[PDB]
Design an enzyme around this catalytic site. Sequence first.
Site, PDB file in Angstrom:
ATOM      1  N   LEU A   7       0.826  -1.196   0.000  1.00  0.00           N
ATOM      2  CA  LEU A   7       0.000   0.000   0.000  1.00  0.00           C
ATOM      3  C   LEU A   7       0.867   1.255   0.000  1.00  0.00           C
ATOM      4  CD1 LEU A   7      -2.374  -1.226   2.799  1.00  0.00           C
ATOM      5  CD2 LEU A   7      -2.906  -1.263   0.386  1.00  0.00           C
ATOM      6  N   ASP A   8       0.250   2.380  -0.350  1.00  0.00           N
ATOM      7  CA  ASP A   8       0.951   3.660  -0.378  1.00  0.00           C
ATOM      8  C   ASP A   8       0.437   4.608   0.704  1.00  0.00           C
ATOM      9  OD1 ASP A   8      -0.872   5.053  -3.253  1.00  0.00           O
ATOM     10  OD2 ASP A   8      -1.500   4.476  -1.238  1.00  0.00           O
ATOM     11  N   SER A   9       0.983   5.814   0.738  1.00  0.00           N
ATOM     12  CA  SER A   9       0.634   6.782   1.759  1.00  0.00           C
ATOM     13  C   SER A   9      -0.868   7.030   1.812  1.00  0.00           C
ATOM     14  CB  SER A   9       1.347   8.107   1.506  1.00  0.00           C
ATOM     15  OG  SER A   9       2.496   7.885   0.747  1.00  0.00           O
ATOM     16  N   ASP A  13      -3.404   5.091   0.966  1.00  0.00           N
ATOM     17  CA  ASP A  13      -4.142   3.978   1.548  1.00  0.00           C
ATOM     18  C   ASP A  13      -3.959   3.915   3.052  1.00  0.00           C
ATOM     19  OD1 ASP A  13      -4.659   3.423  -1.093  1.00  0.00           O
ATOM     20  OD2 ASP A  13      -3.061   1.927  -1.222  1.00  0.00           O
TER      21      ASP A  13
END
Lengths: 172, 171, 181, 122, 86, 114, 19, 155, 12, 459, 121, 106, 67
Positions: E40-42, E44
């Site tokens: 996941l990224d920032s 999410d």
Amino acid sequence: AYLTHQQKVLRLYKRALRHLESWCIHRDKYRYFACLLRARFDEHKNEKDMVKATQLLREAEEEFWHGQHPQPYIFPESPGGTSYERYECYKVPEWCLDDWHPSEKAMYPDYFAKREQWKKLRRESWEREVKQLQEETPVGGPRTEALPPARKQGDLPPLWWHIVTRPRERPM
Amino acid sequence: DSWDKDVYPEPPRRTPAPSPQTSLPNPITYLTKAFDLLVDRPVTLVREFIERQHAKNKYYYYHREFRRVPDITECQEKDVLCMFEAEMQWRRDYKVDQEIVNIIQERLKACQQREGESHRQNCAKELEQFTQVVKAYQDRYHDLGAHYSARKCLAKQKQRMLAERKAAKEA
Amino acid sequence: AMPFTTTALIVGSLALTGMPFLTGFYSKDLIIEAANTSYTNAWALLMTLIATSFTAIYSTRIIFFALLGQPRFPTLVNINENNPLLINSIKRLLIGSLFAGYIISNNIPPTTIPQMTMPYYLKTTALIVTILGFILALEISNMTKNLKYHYPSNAFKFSTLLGYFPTIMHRLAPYMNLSMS
Amino acid sequence: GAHLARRYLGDASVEPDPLRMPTFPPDYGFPERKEREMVATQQEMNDAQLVLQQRDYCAHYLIRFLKCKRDSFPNFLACKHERHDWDYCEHLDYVKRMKEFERERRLLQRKKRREQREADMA
Amino acid sequence: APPLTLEGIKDRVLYVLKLYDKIDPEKLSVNSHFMKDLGLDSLDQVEIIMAMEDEFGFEIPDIDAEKLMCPQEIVDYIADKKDVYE
Amino acid sequence: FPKYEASRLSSLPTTLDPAEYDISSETRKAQAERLAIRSRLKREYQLQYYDPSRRGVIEDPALVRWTYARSANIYALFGIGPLVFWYYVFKTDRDRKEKLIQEGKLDRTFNISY
Amino acid sequence: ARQWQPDVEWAEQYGGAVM
Amino acid sequence: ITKDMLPGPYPKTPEERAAAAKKYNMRVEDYEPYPDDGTGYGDYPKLPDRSQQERDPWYDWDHPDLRLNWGEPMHWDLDMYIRNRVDTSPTPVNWNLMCKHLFGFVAFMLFMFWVGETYPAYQPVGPKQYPYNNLYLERGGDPNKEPEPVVHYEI
Amino acid sequence: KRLFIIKPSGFY
Amino acid sequence: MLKYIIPTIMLMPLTWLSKNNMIWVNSTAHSLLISFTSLLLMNQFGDNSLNFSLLFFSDSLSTPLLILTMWLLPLMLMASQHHLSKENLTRKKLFITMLISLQLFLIMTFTAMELILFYILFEATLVPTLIIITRWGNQTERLNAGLYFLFYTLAGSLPLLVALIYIQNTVGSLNFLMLQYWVQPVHNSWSNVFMWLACMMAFMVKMPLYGLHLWLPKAHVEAPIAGSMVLAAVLLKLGGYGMLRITLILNPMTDFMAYPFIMLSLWGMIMTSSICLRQTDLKSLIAYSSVSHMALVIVAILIQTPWSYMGATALMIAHGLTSSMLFCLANSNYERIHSRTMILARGLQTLLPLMATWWLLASLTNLALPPTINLIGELFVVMSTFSWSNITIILMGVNMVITALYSLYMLIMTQRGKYTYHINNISPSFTRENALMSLHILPLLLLTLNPKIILGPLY
Amino acid sequence: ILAMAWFLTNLNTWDLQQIFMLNPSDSNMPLIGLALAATGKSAQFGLHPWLPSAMEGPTPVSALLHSSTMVVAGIFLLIRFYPLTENNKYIQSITLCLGAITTLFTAMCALTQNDIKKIIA
Amino acid sequence: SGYTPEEKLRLQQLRELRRRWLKDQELSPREPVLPPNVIYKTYRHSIFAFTHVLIPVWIIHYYLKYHVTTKPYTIVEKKPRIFPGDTILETGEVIPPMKEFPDQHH
Amino acid sequence: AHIEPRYRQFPQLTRSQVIQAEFFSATMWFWILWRFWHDSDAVLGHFPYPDPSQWTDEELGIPPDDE
Ligand SMILES: CCCCCCCCCCCCO[C@@H]1O[C@H](CO)[C@@H](O[C@H]2O[C@H](CO)[C@@H](O)[C@H](O)[C@H]2O)[C@H](O)[C@H]1O
Ligand SMILES: CCCCCCCCCCCCO[C@@H]1O[C@H](CO)[C@@H](O[C@H]2O[C@H](CO)[C@@H](O)[C@H](O)[C@H]2O)[C@H](O)[C@H]1O
Ligand SMILES: CCCCCCCCCCCCO[C@@H]1O[C@H](CO)[C@@H](O[C@H]2O[C@H](CO)[C@@H](O)[C@H](O)[C@H]2O)[C@H](O)[C@H]1O
Ligand SMILES: CCCCCCCCCCCCO[C@@H]1O[C@H](CO)[C@@H](O[C@H]2O[C@H](CO)[C@@H](O)[C@H](O)[C@H]2O)[C@H](O)[C@H]1O
Ligand SMILES: *C(=O)CCCCCCCCCCCCC
């Protein structure tokens, strides 16, 4: 602002979603628009021109200010919520137990025996805690409010008493 | 009764006889009977016992009567010995006249309650007697000041008398 | 989920809005008839009728959002309303909200000449505008379920922020006075 | 009512003024008007302690109702008929006042026609 | 409100994550880093915090939220604020 | 969007402030310097707040300076101005009232309390 | 805080030839 | 505290500014005295006129209710800006627009209350009739005078 | 579980 | 009055010959007995005052002040014995001797039948008060506070002495009873204008009148608790008592000479109340509160109506007990945190629950909650001042709004909110401290049951 | 306080029986004093904001505050003095317009409140 | 972002202490160590009625009967309403009826 | 206790709260319905409102225009 550009965008995202949730109310409606809003952030996620990205952020902030809910939802115990600080009048500091009359302390012989051990532990650890900070703080004083962990075994983290012994959130 | 009805008059009380037009029993009738038995009888018995203790010990107290003394109008100027007795006499009259205005105001207030929705027509004499008494009291004592005295009272009267003399001389 | 709370809340809202023959009808209905058959300020009368319509609108607002629809509260369900103290206290006030207006209106002595002769359109004014308030409020409440996204009007903000009276006065008046010395 | 629309937004000189009427003599157009009769005496209204505003031409029906109210206690649902009798009388009293307003209006209509007819023929 | 427990908090924290479509409910474990392991990224991560906020009915400030990178850290954070010691 | 317009009692939001953006090496060096002062003072406070044997008050020199500066200037709405204004209001009011009483034109029918 | 009493700096106000 | 740590006269030179800032625990760049004009401030710093409500609620302040840290310079009007009193935080609406809309609402309402007074509502009905000469005696009329009778007729 | 409730002394 | 003067003097041998550890017990026990016997002064008559002898008399105006004065001595010993606990024994006895000599002068001041006797005793109170402030004050500024107090008072008293001696020369007597019958009207002339100012400006300073009030916050901030109790409770009342007696011989000139001083009091009360909202020092807030409350008394005395003198009498007694209580309450905090800053120690209701009840009761009396005698006195002044000029109701009404604001603000600031984290020496209230507040508030509230005995001679 | 001052000065009483018996004709001043008193207590327009803010207290306080105690004392005070107001058309116009704006303004505010206690308030 | 290893370690250490502190707030079984159907409900309301109603009303009645009503104009009654056809108990007088009604009806 | 909380599910109810709620809701509607049948005039009007134009000049005493 102390915040990096990356931090600023995320705070806007969380803030924007929450005010969007106040407008929609109904969860199905909120879900539909939340995904559209996430799409707008995902569109420029890979912008690499920090003059364009900075512009995109500033315009986004202006749009949020025009579209914000005048009365956004607040969690009851968050600042501004209806239960914020509701219990502060029940939080009594632990040093007040020292002034208890002997007859008052006699009703809890076992609690006040444990309490003495913690006070002993606080007395014995203090000098080491002070020393650890002195020999880790750069000349001129600290530059940040971050405190160190304990290094040796049998050492407690410096400046721990008022964190460990703080009142419970539901003290009564 | 126990006060002088003349000072505190009350018109005769006319209470209509019950004329129920309902088969139901009046709740107030039963509560009256219960109140009489439960509350009135034991309260009366305690009182009668107390009034028996009082009877065995009867002693008296009196209302002080003050002899009259020469007024401030008869005192030689700066004669403190005669002025002092006229000043004490004037102060007792002043305090008595305050109570006469309270008696009349009490009659007026009692009338307004007693007559009810008809008080405007039925309390005309009490209102008239209050208006006349307040006029006299105002003429005597109003505007003398905190440091009032029989001297200042007299000076106010003389000014009033001179004005009324010019009223008659003018017509 | 909260049947007894729901019953009392509907009775209360109907009593407030002036539903015929509940506790609030025996005073509000009389008052409106007296106002619009009186020698009075026309603006005052109109503003009292519009406010009566608004009473239905914000009563629907509480009922619609609190009770109807799908739950919007957190997941850990703790809904419980079975304490006898809660039930009895509301039960007694529920009974008052039904009959108290009837009981009092029939026992107090008359002290005026109640104006009971007026055109049909003055007699039924309170009922009609209250009904229009329910209809109009229902349509707006249902209007929030649509997938539309709207900007607040100046009117919406003005009502939401209480006419700005607290926002302005509670900053200006304290500031002038506290900086006066 | 429409009467306000006619007066304020229309012609005011031919609509009655509620503060000043009647502006015509009681007999004008009436051969021998009978005076209203007051059943209740002044003493009866005084003893009954009626509110002064309730001491109007229907006060005898009010007195009868109040007496029946006292006598039927605790049955507070009694006096159905007595209350209605008083209410109905107050209605006819109000209808008489409605007639007065219309009479005043129609007389003003007649006046203006008279003034117009004696104007154009001048 | 009924009291919480450490295992109860952990059960519900994962329960919410198991209802998120970007996470594989099989790869999920209390020690999965949302960035390194779950991919996941920032953006999410922000939504995960909002989901936990809605779950437990209280706000986590942004200054604290950005540091919660694995489910165990979230569990530890909630217990500290709710004075859960089990 | 209509731009925000800031008043004395309604300050400008940080997110709408051009200064908050356009980071400069000097502004960050200014921000980093303020944080150092705050951390230096926090450590000074914490080493007394957390001391096991301290029973009393941690005298704050910032609070002492504040009260001292506030209580010093002992000595419009503070001069003859307000006094003269109110002098004429009451003198004018009581002069009219006195004239009416003398001319018997003031109703004091039941006034006997003063 | 114990009662203040004049120190040396205060006392020397009164040790000159004149006030 | 020693006299050298208390407030003093208005600073004049760059070194009198440098020393004042150090006394108040401020950067010399951030230190600004109140403009010299005899009002009596002295060298006290002029801090932004911002309410304490505007500060970060989540930061761990030394005084959480006052949102103050131990040792930082207190605003001259701090007692006016505590969370119980004057608030300056941003509003969702412009201050000038709030004043225009609020005043306009009040000014318009007063105008239409005047129009209502000039053109009142009323029902098409004659004046209410009371017996016994408009209840002359009941309304406190003096009985010795004989009032001009008020006569009401049927219709 | 019964938790100890911290209070100021009420004896005085 | 010798049944009170001699016992009061006997408090001096009793204190000096008491065993070392018993000075506070003996003085307090016997000063309370003297206070008990002071109730015999309430043999008042409708017409005549109580005239004991050629030197002393008592009427309905001096009796409540006399009972207040003698009640206060035992309360000041309780308030004093803590912060003097480490004092040298002899200096303890001298401190108690100064309080006893102050009561002695005060009870003679309020009963003196001769105005020049009143002046000497009126002016003699300065010596013990000045000594208490400058010797047993705790800060540097106690020396300047002493001089301001001294020279503000003498600036007005010296003109007063000349005016009184002039009046005895032309009237032949300064006996107050004689002046009631031999008083002659004062006519308009520049000479009589300055005779009026001399006769009044000494009392205006002690009230204090707004404008001449700046000595009072200085003295309070620097005085010990006992000095603040007597200064607020009784010494301010000397001016009011002097003005109620001297205005007898200033009519009718008081009709127009009052105007500037009514304006100062009507406006001054609004400004001093507003200042109380921004005070950072607790003792200084209570001092500025007295200036606001005493401005009502000046207005009431100057308009000279039966209702205004009853109101002014009640205000002086009520304010005396209330202001003394507030100072003792702020001292109890100061003995713990050793600071007068109001914002320093917050949220005290959590740590001192019963002392928070005393704070509430004291604040309610300060804002004059019905039916307290604080309201009764304040109301009567408002009723009469409205008759004087209807417009004053606006200033009177505004002052009640501001008075509520700062009274509850002082309650909220110190008692509510969160407690100060680093202050960890808030020990439980002592029995001595609780008894001290109950001896202020209980008699104050009891007088509501029978307020006629504090409504003065015009009742 | 204005009402009590006027009644004492002009009628010599604070007792209601004497106020109604003397029946002052010139009641504009005492009745405006009571109207201003009722505005604050009953939270009519101008002095209204405090009642919604009173939702800080526990719900039982709001229940008792808003029904059978404080807020109707303002209305109850004006009902006590209906023998005076019923002969004063000036006071009737003032109170009608004061009530009319209050009922509209605060019902308009309730349309968009999201806090349940504030809506009822 | 996340915690640095030192930030993580310190939280772990304060966590152990905090949870041990909270565990120590529990009371032992012996603590606190204090020092030395209708028939019941009917009794409970019998005592309340007697102490809180009967005794007060006895005191009030004695107060009002023998101290308040013995003074003039202390208790003042609105005089009873008299209606046509009523009978006065005091004087046995009969009030005449009202005159014959015109007799409109509906 | 007597009602165990649930998770993401409809809460448990007692019979008494459901029965009592249903009974008092019916009591409201019986009372409203019963009152219409007996007091329908309180909602529709007690007496007819006359049409003022249906009154004759004879009734109101309007004399002819000529005289
Ligand atoms: C039965 C209904 C009862 C309630 C009726 C209430 C009516 C009250 C009407 C008050 C109107 C006052 O509000 C009015 O609105 C417009 C709309 O922005 C404002 O207009 C303002 O906004 C924008 C810019 O910001 C521009 O149009 C204009 O330059 C500016 O003045 C007016 O400046 C203001 O005077
Ligand atoms: C208004 C009616 C009555 C007014 C009476 C006025 C007469 C003067 C009374 C006070 C006399 C005090 O005499 C002297 O004054 C000055 C200030 O005033 C004080 O000195 C103080 O202020 C001065 C300047 O304001 C400073 O330089 C000094 O550092 C400070 O200590 C002295 O410590 C005091 O001894
Ligand atoms: C705190 C400050 C208070 C300030 C108060 C100011 C009050 C001002 C009072 C003015 C009145 C003075 O007194 C007034 O002057 C002189 C006395 O010399 C009197 O008049 C006398 O002297 C004047 C001299 O000009 C002659 O014209 C006149 O023939 C003579 O009779 C006035 O008849 C008297 O009324
Ligand atoms: C004179 C005053 C009026 C007197 C009339 C009084 C009304 C009758 C009182 C009894 C009311 C019982 O009302 C009835 O109860 C059952 C029991 O829950 C309800 O039934 C409901 O709960 C049960 C349990 O799940 C199920 O039957 C069903 O799922 C649900 O509909 C009915 O929906 C309701 O109609
Ligand atoms: C005329 O009789 C005066 C009435 C004053 C305003 C009353 C409002 C009624 C409007 C009639 C239309 C019907 C809508 C319910």
